[PDB]
Design an enzyme around this catalytic site. Structure first.
Site, short mmCIF file in Angstrom:
data_model
loop_
_atom_site.label_atom_id
_atom_site.label_comp_id
_atom_site.label_asym_id
_atom_site.label_seq_id
_atom_site.Cartn_x
_atom_site.Cartn_y
_atom_site.Cartn_z
N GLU A 47 0.66 -1.38 -0.01
CA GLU A 47 0.11 0.05 -0.04
C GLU A 47 0.74 1.31 0.01
O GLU A 47 0.64 1.98 0.91
CB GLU A 47 -1.02 0.08 1.33
CG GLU A 47 -0.19 0.05 2.43
CD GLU A 47 0.18 -1.29 3.00
OE1 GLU A 47 0.31 -2.30 2.46
OE2 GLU A 47 0.23 -1.37 4.37
N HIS B 232 -7.83 -4.03 -0.82
CA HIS B 232 -7.19 -4.46 0.16
C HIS B 232 -6.10 -3.15 0.41
O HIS B 232 -6.18 -2.22 1.38
CB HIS B 232 -6.53 -5.78 0.27
CG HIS B 232 -5.60 -5.85 1.64
ND1 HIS B 232 -6.08 -6.60 2.66
CD2 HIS B 232 -4.40 -5.46 1.86
CE1 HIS B 232 -5.17 -6.54 3.59
NE2 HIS B 232 -4.12 -5.98 3.10
N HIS C 245 -5.61 0.55 2.81
CA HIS C 245 -4.64 0.89 3.47
C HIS C 245 -4.48 2.27 3.75
O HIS C 245 -4.12 2.87 4.54
CB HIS C 245 -3.37 0.26 3.27
CG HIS C 245 -2.87 -1.12 3.92
ND1 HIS C 245 -3.21 -1.31 5.32
CD2 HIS C 245 -3.02 -2.22 3.47
CE1 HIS C 245 -2.83 -2.46 5.50
NE2 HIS C 245 -2.85 -2.98 4.49
N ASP D 263 10.01 -10.47 9.33
CA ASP D 263 9.93 -11.37 8.14
C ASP D 263 9.91 -12.99 8.41
O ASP D 263 9.04 -13.53 7.55
CB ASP D 263 11.10 -11.19 7.04
CG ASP D 263 10.85 -9.96 6.19
OD1 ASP D 263 9.74 -9.63 5.97
OD2 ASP D 263 11.93 -9.01 6.07
N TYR E 190 -3.78 -11.08 9.86
CA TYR E 190 -4.86 -10.70 9.06
C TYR E 190 -6.25 -11.54 9.41
O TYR E 190 -7.17 -10.78 9.55
CB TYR E 190 -4.47 -11.22 7.64
CG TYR E 190 -3.31 -10.53 6.88
CD1 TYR E 190 -1.98 -11.05 7.39
CD2 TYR E 190 -3.63 -9.57 6.21
CE1 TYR E 190 -1.11 -10.27 6.61
CE2 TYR E 190 -2.32 -9.02 5.51
CZ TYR E 190 -1.13 -9.46 5.72
OH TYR E 190 0.09 -8.82 5.10
C1 LIG Z 1 -5.38 -8.82 -0.01
C2 LIG Z 1 -3.91 -8.87 1.10
C3 LIG Z 1 -3.98 -10.15 1.88
C4 LIG Z 1 -2.69 -9.11 -0.16
C5 LIG Z 1 -1.49 -9.08 0.66
N1 LIG Z 1 -0.73 -7.66 0.74
C6 LIG Z 1 -0.73 -7.11 1.83
O1 LIG Z 1 -1.00 -7.33 2.92
C7 LIG Z 1 -0.21 -5.66 1.91
O2 LIG Z 1 -1.04 -4.61 2.16
C8 LIG Z 1 1.01 -5.74 3.17
N2 LIG Z 1 1.40 -4.42 3.41
C9 LIG Z 1 2.20 -6.64 2.42
C10 LIG Z 1 3.37 -6.57 3.40
C11 LIG Z 1 3.13 -7.03 4.76
C12 LIG Z 1 4.39 -6.74 5.67
C13 LIG Z 1 5.45 -6.69 5.25
C14 LIG Z 1 5.64 -6.35 3.87
C15 LIG Z 1 4.70 -6.33 3.02
C16 LIG Z 1 -0.59 -10.05 -0.03
O3 LIG Z 1 -0.50 -11.16 -0.29
O4 LIG Z 1 0.77 -9.47 -0.51
ZN LIG Z 2 -2.38 -5.33 4.04
#
Ligand SMILES: CC(C)C[C@H](NC(=O)[C@@H](O)[C@H](N)Cc1ccccc1)C(=O)O
Ligand SMILES: [Zn+2]
Ligand SMILES: Clc1ccc2[nH]ccc2c1
Ligand SMILES: [Yb+3]
Ligand SMILES: [Yb+3]
Ligand SMILES: [Yb+3]
EC number: 3.3.2.6
Length: 607
Positions: free
Chosen positions: A268, A292, A296, A372, A380
């Site tokens: 985001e 999604h 954000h 990580d 989530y």
């Molecule tokens: C619909 C969502 C569950 C999709 C999901 N994307 C996200 O959650 C993003 O908003 C997150 N900001 C991705 C993220 C989280 C933590 C560290 C680095 C990157 C993904 O799978 O990348």
């Molecule tokens: Zn997210």
């Protein structure tokens, strides 16, 4: 206290602004330049402050036009190395100075992936992209690398002239580089304060197409057409998100479609969401990812988690809005379908980690843990399930969305903790505290495992999926004949996906069953990445040698961690493919995203 950061905390000083001047060097794979931090002391008689860095070479530090003293402490692993800076003059409370740091990044910066021409679509120019969430901003520039601090920024970025730079900011024009006419300088302003993890940069042979009044899609030339169609619902999703969350304050909402090694489905980044090209299913079916990232723009970028221990605040409220956008767009029954699937992803993660594992806690203590390494669906879907449970408890969606909106207004531009959230929930629903006190807060927030209460879901769209999956699991050899291509006649691509997830949960099935499934459903031909992913997993865990090359190919031709990790893991756990899995990882490792490389390496027990 931010336990993932080595910087002076916000109680001591806070960064108000970053002016970044840097030059991208593809030959050396370095960014070189200056980070000018406008720093406001929070303390009397402040004489030093400490910044996060990671694999940065510091040239010098300049305050009031003079080189000043500083030191890098011993590396602390994935946290990097603290940088202590000696102020020339003690600062009173609220006093501001500008500190200009000359620095250069490492080619192995965990925030960056440098791509060779062959690793892109066009095959002539190289490419660079960043990913700072959670704590990789320190591997680009020295900073207080904690979401408890919010800053504006402006940046000027010099790149080879035939390339284009974009950032998480409003584009402020381009000019030739005065110091070198083989180059262009691109300028950027982010006027809305942000946590530094939202800083983003891409440099590449990029083109843009317009797809709504405030949205352009950007990617390499060969992906533009397909992305403009895939993401065509973007404007209408913004309109709904604005209605749920209040004004969109960021000016632009652009999309960047990255090369296939982008480690996430989406990110985001303010004004410029980054997405995986594995979203390009040809039918818009994976657009919930856009919903999604859009969400954000309120939950996450406006109201931010104060530390990563409270990540669920970011993600749970965002999934909750995402599923409301999709329910507005496609009907309440669809929101419930996606809600139930998400509970199912929750079951998987808890099963994988184990029901007492600390990372299955909603609120987590991330001291000594690399975020990580801890990253999963738990924050989530457990977060979403909490909100969905409170929704049903407190009088339904319309009422809970009134709370969501007021929570956004309330904490706009702030960084907050789980208690800040709980307090406002109690305040907002004071007339219903009796109901609130029946919630098992200690279990929901601080206990491992599945949540103590499972919400109520409409089953309508889900039944046909559970029913087909149950026929397949209870089938004996003499039942295989009765399966036909027409079993799928009435399933949406999402129901096919949920059909596979149900079945993957009980994997393995007998090899005979899988082969018949390929015979009658021809899942090998489907190119929707989610469906194909689950089908290849079902195949590899059920031990079907034919799927070994298909799984190796998907795992390496894209790098979305959601897919690439479990594929490699599955492949490694299958004796016939074990050796080729570790061999393939080892051949590809050097040219992989460094975070993916590290995680796949750990999952495989290699190095
Ligand atoms: C619909 C969502 C569950 C999709 C999901 N994307 C996200 O959650 C993003 O908003 C997150 N900001 C991705 C993220 C989280 C933590 C560290 C680095 C990157 C993904 O799978 O990348
Ligand atoms: Zn997210
Ligand atoms: Cl990065 C990150 C932050 C907060 C979290 N809570 C549970 C897992 C997790 C991961
Ligand atoms: Yb301007
Ligand atoms: Yb209170
Ligand atoms: Yb039988």
């Amino acid at each position: 206290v931010d336990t993932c950061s080595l910087a002076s905390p916000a109680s001591v000083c806070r960064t108000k602004h970053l002016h970044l001047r840097c030059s991208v060097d593809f030959t050396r794979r370095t960014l070189t330049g200056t980070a000018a931090l406008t720093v406001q002391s929070q303390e009397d008689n402040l004489r030093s402050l400490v910044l996060d860095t990671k694999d940065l070479t510091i040239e010098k530090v300049v305050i009031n036009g003079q080189e000043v003293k500083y030191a890098l402490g011993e590396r602390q692993s994935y946290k990097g190395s603290p940088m202590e800076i000696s102020l020339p003059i003690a600062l009173s409370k609220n006093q501001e100075i500008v500190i200009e740091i000359s620095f250069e990044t490492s080619p192995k910066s965990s925030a960056l992936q440098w791509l060779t021409p062959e690793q892109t679509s066009g095959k002539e120019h190289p490419y660079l992209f960043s990913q700072c969430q959670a704590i990789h901003c320190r591997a680009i520039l020295p900073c207080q690398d904690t979401p408890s601090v919010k800053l504006t920024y402006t940046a000027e970025v010099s790149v080879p002239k035939e390339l284009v730079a974009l950032m998480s900011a409003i584009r402020d024009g381009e000019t030739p580089d005065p110091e070198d006419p083989s180059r262009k300088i691109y300028k950027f302003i982010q006027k809305v304060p942000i946590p530094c993890y939202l800083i983003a940069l891409v440099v590449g042979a990029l083109e843009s197409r317009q797809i709504g009044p405030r949205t352009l899609v950007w990617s390499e030339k060969e992906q533009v057409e397909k992305s403009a169609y895939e993401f065509s619902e973007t404007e209408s999703m913004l309109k709904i998100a604005e209605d749920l969350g209040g004004p969109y304050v960021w000016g632009q909402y652009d999309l960047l479609v990255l090369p296939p090694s982008f480690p996430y489905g989406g990110m985001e980044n303010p004004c410029l969401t980054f997405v995986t090209p594995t979203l390009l299913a040809g039918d818009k079916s994976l657009s919930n990812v856009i919903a999604h990232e859009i969400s954000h723009s309120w939950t996450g970028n406006l109201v931010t988690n104060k530390t990563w221990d409270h990540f669920w605040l970011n993600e749970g409220h965002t999934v909750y809005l995402e599923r409301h956008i999709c329910g507005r767009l496609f009907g309440e029954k669809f929101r419930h379908f996606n809600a139930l699937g998400g509970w199912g992803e929750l079951q998987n993660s808890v099963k994988t980690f184990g029901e007492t594992h600390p990372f299955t806690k909603l609120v987590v203590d991330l001291t000594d843990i690399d975020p990580d390494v801890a990253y999963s669906s738990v924050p989530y879907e457990k977060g979403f399930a909490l909100l969905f449970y409170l929704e049903q408890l407190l009088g339904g969606p319309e009422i809970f969305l009134g709370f969501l909106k007021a929570y956004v207004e309330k904490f706009s531009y702030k960084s907050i903790t789980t208690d800040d959230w709980k307090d406002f929930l109690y305040s907002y629903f004071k007339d219903k505290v009796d109901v609130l006190n029946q919630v098992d807060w200690n279990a929901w927030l601080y206990s491992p495992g599945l949540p103590p209460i499972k919400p109520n879901y409409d089953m309508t769209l889900t039944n046909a999926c559970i029913a087909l999956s149950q026929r397949w699991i209870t089938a004996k050899e003499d039942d295989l004949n009765s399966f036909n291509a027409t079993d799928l006649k009435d399933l949406s691509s999402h129901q096919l996906n949920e059909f596979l997830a149900q079945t993957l949960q009980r994997a393995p099935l007998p090899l005979g069953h899988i082969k018949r499934m390929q015979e009658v459903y021809n899942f090998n031909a489907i190119n929707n990445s989610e469906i194909r992913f689950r089908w290849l997993r079902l195949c590899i865990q059920s031990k079907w040698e034919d799927a070994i090359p298909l799984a190796l190919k998907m795992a390496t031709e894209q790098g979305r961690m959601k897919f690439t990790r479990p594929l490699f893991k599955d492949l490694a756990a299958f004796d016939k493919s074990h050796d080729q899995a570790v061999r393939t990882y080892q051949e590809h490792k050097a040219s992989m995203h460094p975070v993916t490389a590290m995680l796949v390496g750990k999952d495989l027990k290699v190095d």
